[PDB]
Design a protein around this nucleic acid. Structure first.
Ligand SMILES: [Mg+2]
Ligand SMILES: [Mg+2]
Ligand SMILES: [Mg+2]
Ligand SMILES: [Mg+2]
Ligand SMILES: [Mg+2]
Ligand SMILES: [Mg+2]
Ligand SMILES: [Mg+2]
Ligand SMILES: [Mg+2]
Ligand SMILES: [Mg+2]
Ligand SMILES: [Mg+2]
Ligand SMILES: [Mg+2]
Ligand SMILES: [Mg+2]
Ligand SMILES: [Mg+2]
Ligand SMILES: [Mg+2]
Ligand SMILES: [Mg+2]
Ligand SMILES: [Mg+2]
Ligand SMILES: [Mg+2]
Ligand SMILES: [Mg+2]
Ligand SMILES: [Mg+2]
Ligand SMILES: [Mg+2]
Ligand SMILES: [Mg+2]
Ligand SMILES: [Zn+2]
Lengths: 307, 153, 223, 115, 110
RNA sequence: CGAUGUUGGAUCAGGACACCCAAAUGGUGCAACCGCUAUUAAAGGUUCGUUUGUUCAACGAUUAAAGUCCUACGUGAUCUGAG
């Protein structure tokens, strides 16, 4: 039984392809609109905040980098993380996951149905949401659990806060030792023959082998890295965008896993933040379009002068 | 590390790549359909589209005239470019060229070949890959689903 | 006589694959900043006086006047370089257009030059960079269409900061005949790249982008 | 940026900085943990065949925005206790040097022009 | 560097019979609906393309014989017509190539 | 001795502690600052230049310090050939 390869457009006609496309688009729109009211159908009970509580995170998109100015005159550079479509997919109990914290699975931006596997498509069909690109697991406390299918917004974080940003860094492929490890090269022109960038000696004569920790040319860049303690300066609620201080690992337009800072200096700033998550349908009062920090020079400013 | 590179290296350098591209473009403009290596034709497709755009830009435009003069090595094709190709591409926007992969060459190199062709020319049509008819089983099921959608709408 | 339309160079997004939403938001922020700070029309070669909040000066503000060497950057990070010779010491300051510390930008002489970047003024004679710190502003009327100053500049002896004779700079504002020789020009022409002018795939067409930019600008002004 | 073996120009009116010599004043040592010197960094000079201390006033490397970029590597000569040997500085000096007035009081007192 | 010892046939077989070195089977092969010959799904049929290329070669030979010079590029549109056919009201004002062969089934009148 | 290719330098260093710095202490003929000794600790560091092929050595400017050694006086199928 020599079965041949197939795809979704192989057997469709010139008139059914637009029909299938629009049918899937309408289904995705309806599914996304069904979840816009997570607090009125059957939300899970909300627990009070505790000193040792941990919150869920988001999966945003690294848009770009923008300058920003502080009221004291300094200039920082911020990265734009846009929460396109962030949802809670599944929940895993603490004893069944780690024995210390529960696991909440969070999915990022939407992708096409026609290029996902049967198991993934079935899982998203049972869940009731269109497939996501990036899926991550967050370790939260049992009092911060959220019902799967709940959307998440950039208002989950607030201006003035420290966050941890995890992403796959820009992959530079098989790089030489000089760029991978910062090794100094051999001199350029004083007689050296074909050794201007070689690592040189790699071990010792007596050992008669090279140690497992030897720095040698290889892959560089396409690995997961986390930046710790990035300050949040600004929140654009209309477009769901976070202005995080400094640089962010990964290329632009990549999926970025963002969560609260785990450094000991910023352990208990979860008190003033919305503990379970941000529910736009609960307060019954729209947030401002832009929420700024106490030191950000807003675009509409009196053109600060020193006294 | 070649992130964000749009032009592939061909020939003996950038000038050699430009000369190869202009030879291919002259052949394409003259014959209305040529075949070559897949990479060279893929590179040439964009230049062909931009040349048709420059021809649509006008005969009296000095910039377009100089660009055509440079790119068309045979000088008898510039009147053809400005009086045949551009008149028949007026309502269109970017669908000027058609590129299709053909079987590899017969000789030992076995290169991957493509054929590029200005649309609406005076040549036998290529064996274009046609989609299935609505009379197929799956297409008929989709048609019935569409009919019920329209009825419920 | 009709009226011509001038868009600031910083409003044009770069060629990269950045999402247009970032450009939209950056334009919104920079238009909001322009609502407060009146950023006038100026090109490379225009003479500008910039007032910046200086916390350590005798007065709380400091004024710097100079000719604009170059304008570079996209969106909120746009910068322009002002050059002036102060008591025989050439000084260059790279101002940021949308920095809140700037109080006022004043065009004291709106003019164009033969080049889009007057970086060769470092190697030029000091008389071409010396400007009166207290010159009165020269008003201009619209029907002058910002006249181009066809000024050819003498140069100091070689070497210069860069190889301005090379074709990669495409400079028309230097009197090369009095500083170089025909042999030197013949050697310099070996670096020419004639195919770049007719590549026609390296060109960046931004007609629709500029139309959308100005539509947003008009919407902001009406709002 | 001023580092070792860099020729500089003395700005203040001093006998060492004015009397002609067959060797330009070169930088002997920069007093940072790095070998590079920026505006306001004490460095060592070999003027007229003797060792002297100087302060970097302006350099030709671009720095942060709204910072003056001069056409020469300007230095003002200093003493062992940190006081200038000259009486007046004619060339413009960056206004950021006034931030650290605690240790450059006598140096900024003789400065006349700030940019 | 020179090999220290002769590599045995067992190691040689383990190296050059690995699935990485073996030829992979192609699962994108189908029959062309027109002529029944084999073709790949993403590649034009060899038989049909040979037919079209040959017919184009004959047409180009005729239209090059019609022109007495190498630089005589027509400045008007071009139409190919076969035996037993006459130019229509829309084909007037163009250049015409006449072929003695009958019109092929695949060549649409348009 | 049917070949274990050499000093010094470049690149990369693994290790020991008989610790130069950084850390915790005991005694001082330890008033304080500088110091002199001894105990414990080897995760991390231990500069740039003139002359000399130089390892060393003298000298200039600094540093928290510019440690002693082993590794075929580490490392020439990675490099130099100044001796
Ligand atoms: Mg890559
Ligand atoms: Mg090097
Ligand atoms: Mg040699
Ligand atoms: Mg070499
Ligand atoms: Mg050799
Ligand atoms: Mg061993
Ligand atoms: Mg090649
Ligand atoms: Mg230079
Ligand atoms: Mg002497
Ligand atoms: Mg022997
Ligand atoms: Mg032997
Ligand atoms: Mg070591
Ligand atoms: Mg011990
Ligand atoms: Mg100690
Ligand atoms: Mg050690
Ligand atoms: Mg020995
Ligand atoms: Mg040895
Ligand atoms: Mg060896
Ligand atoms: Mg050796
Ligand atoms: Mg060798
Ligand atoms: Mg010798
Ligand atoms: Zn066929």
């Amino acid at each position: 039984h020599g079965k041949s390869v197939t795809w979704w457009d192989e057997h469709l006609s010139e008139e059914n392809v637009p029909f299938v496309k629009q049918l899937v688009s309408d289904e995705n729109k309806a599914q996304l609109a069904s979840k816009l009211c997570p607090l009125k159908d059957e939300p899970w009970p909300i627990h009070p905040w505790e000193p040792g509580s941990s919150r869920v995170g988001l999966i945003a998109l690294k848009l770009g980098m923008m300058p920003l100015w502080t009221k004291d005159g300094q200039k920082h550079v911020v990265t734009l993380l846009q929460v396109q479509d962030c949802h809670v997919l599944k929940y895993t109990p603490k004893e069944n996951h780690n024995g210390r914290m529960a696991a909440l699975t969070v999915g990022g931006k939407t992708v096409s149905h026609f290029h996902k596997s049967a198991s993934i498509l079935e899982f998203y069909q049972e869940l009731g949401l269109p497939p996501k690109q990036k899926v991550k697991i967050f370790n939260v406390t049992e009092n911060a659990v959220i019902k799967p299918g709940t959307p998440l917004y950039a208002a989950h974080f607030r201006p003035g806060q420290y966050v941890d940003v995890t992403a796959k860094t820009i992959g530079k492929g098989f790089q030489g030792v000089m760029r991978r490890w910062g090794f100094k090269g051999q001199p350029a022109t004083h007689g050296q023959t074909k050794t201007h960038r070689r690592p040189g000696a790699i071990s010792t004569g007596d050992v008669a082998r090279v140690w497992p920790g030897t720095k040698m040319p290889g892959q560089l860049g396409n690995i997961d890295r986390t930046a710790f303690g990035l300050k949040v300066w600004r929140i654009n609620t209309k477009h769901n965008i976070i202005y995080v201080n400094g640089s962010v690992p990964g290329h632009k337009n990549c999926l970025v896993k963002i969560k609260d800072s785990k450094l000991p200096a910023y352990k208990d700033f979860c008190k003033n933040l919305p503990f379970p998550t941000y529910f736009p349908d609960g307060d019954e009062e729209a947030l401002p379009e832009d929420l700024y920090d106490e030191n950000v020079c807003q675009p509409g400013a009196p053109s600060i002068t020193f006294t | 590390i070649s992130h964000g590179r749009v032009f592939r290296r061909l020939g003996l350098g950038p000038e050699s790549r430009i000369h190869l591209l202009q030879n291919l473009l002259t052949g394409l403009v003259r014959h209305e359909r040529i075949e070559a290596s897949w990479a060279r034709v893929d590179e040439l497709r964009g230049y062909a589209e931009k040349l048709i755009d420059y021809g649509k830009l006008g005969d009296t435009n000095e910039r377009a005239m100089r660009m055509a003069d440079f790119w068309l090595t045979e000088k008898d094709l510039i009147p053809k470019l400005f009086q045949v190709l551009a008149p028949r591409f007026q309502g269109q926007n970017g669908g000027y060229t058609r590129m299709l992969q053909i079987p590899n060459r017969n000789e030992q190199d076995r290169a991957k070949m493509a054929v590029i062709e200005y649309k609406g020319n005076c040549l036998p049509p290529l064996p274009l890959p046609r989609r299935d008819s609505n009379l197929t089983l799956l297409n008929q099921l989709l048609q019935g689903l569409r009919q019920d959608q329209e009825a419920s709408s | 006589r009709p009226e011509t339309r001038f868009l600031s160079p910083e409003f044009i997004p770069p060629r990269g694959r950045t999402n247009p939403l970032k450009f939209q938001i950056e334009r919104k922020d920079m238009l909001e900043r322009r609502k407060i700070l009146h950023i006038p029309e100026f090109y490379v070669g225009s003479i500008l006086r910039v007032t910046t909040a200086d916390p350590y000066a005798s007065a709380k503000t400091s004024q710097f006047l100079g000719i604009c060497i170059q304008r570079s950057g996209s969106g909120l990070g746009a910068t322009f370089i002002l050059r002036n010779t102060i008591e025989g010491q050439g000084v260059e300051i790279c101002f940021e257009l949308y920095n809140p510390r700037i109080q006022e930008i004043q065009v004291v002489k709106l003019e164009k030059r033969l080049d889009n970047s007057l970086l060769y003024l470092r190697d030029a004679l000091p008389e071409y960079s010396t400007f009166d710190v207290n010159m009165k502003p020269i008003t201009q009327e619209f029907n002058q269409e910002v006249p181009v100053n066809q000024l050819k500049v003498k140069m100091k002896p070689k070497p210069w900061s860069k190889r301005w004779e090379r074709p990669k700079f495409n400079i028309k504002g230097i009197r090369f005949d009095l500083c170089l020789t025909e042999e030197q020009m013949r050697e310099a022409q070996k670096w020419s790249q004639p195919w770049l002018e007719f590549d026609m795939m390296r060109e960046y067409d931004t007609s629709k982008i500029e139309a959308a930019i100005w539509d947003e600008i008009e919407a902001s002004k009406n709002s | 940026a001023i580092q070792k073996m860099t020729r500089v120009r003395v700005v203040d009116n001093s006998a060492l900085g004015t009397t002609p010599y067959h060797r330009p004043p070169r930088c002997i040592h920069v007093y940072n943990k790095t070998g590079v010197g920026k505006v306001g960094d004490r460095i060592l000079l070999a003027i007229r065949g003797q060792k002297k201390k100087a302060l970097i006033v302006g350099h030709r490397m671009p720095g942060p925005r709204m910072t003056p970029r001069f056409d020469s590597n300007n230095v003002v000569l200093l003493e062992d206790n940190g006081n200038p040997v000259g009486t007046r500085i004619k060339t413009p000096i960056p206004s950021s040097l006034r931030q650290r007035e605690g240790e450059f009081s006598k140096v900024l007192a003789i400065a006349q022009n700030f940019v | 560097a020179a090999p220290k010892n002769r590599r045995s046939i067992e190691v040689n077989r383990c190296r050059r019979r690995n699935p990485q070195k073996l030829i992979k089977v192609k699962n994108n092969i189908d029959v062309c609906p027109e002529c029944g010959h084999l073709k790949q799904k993403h590649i034009l049929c060899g038989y049909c393309y040979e037919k079209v290329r040959k017919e184009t070669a004959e047409i180009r030979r005729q239209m090059g014989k019609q022109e007495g010079g190498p630089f005589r590029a027509p400045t008007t549109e071009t139409v190919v017509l076969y035996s037993g056919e006459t130019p229509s009201e829309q084909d007037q004002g163009k250049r015409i190539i006449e072929r003695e062969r009958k019109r092929p089934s695949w060549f649409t009148q348009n």
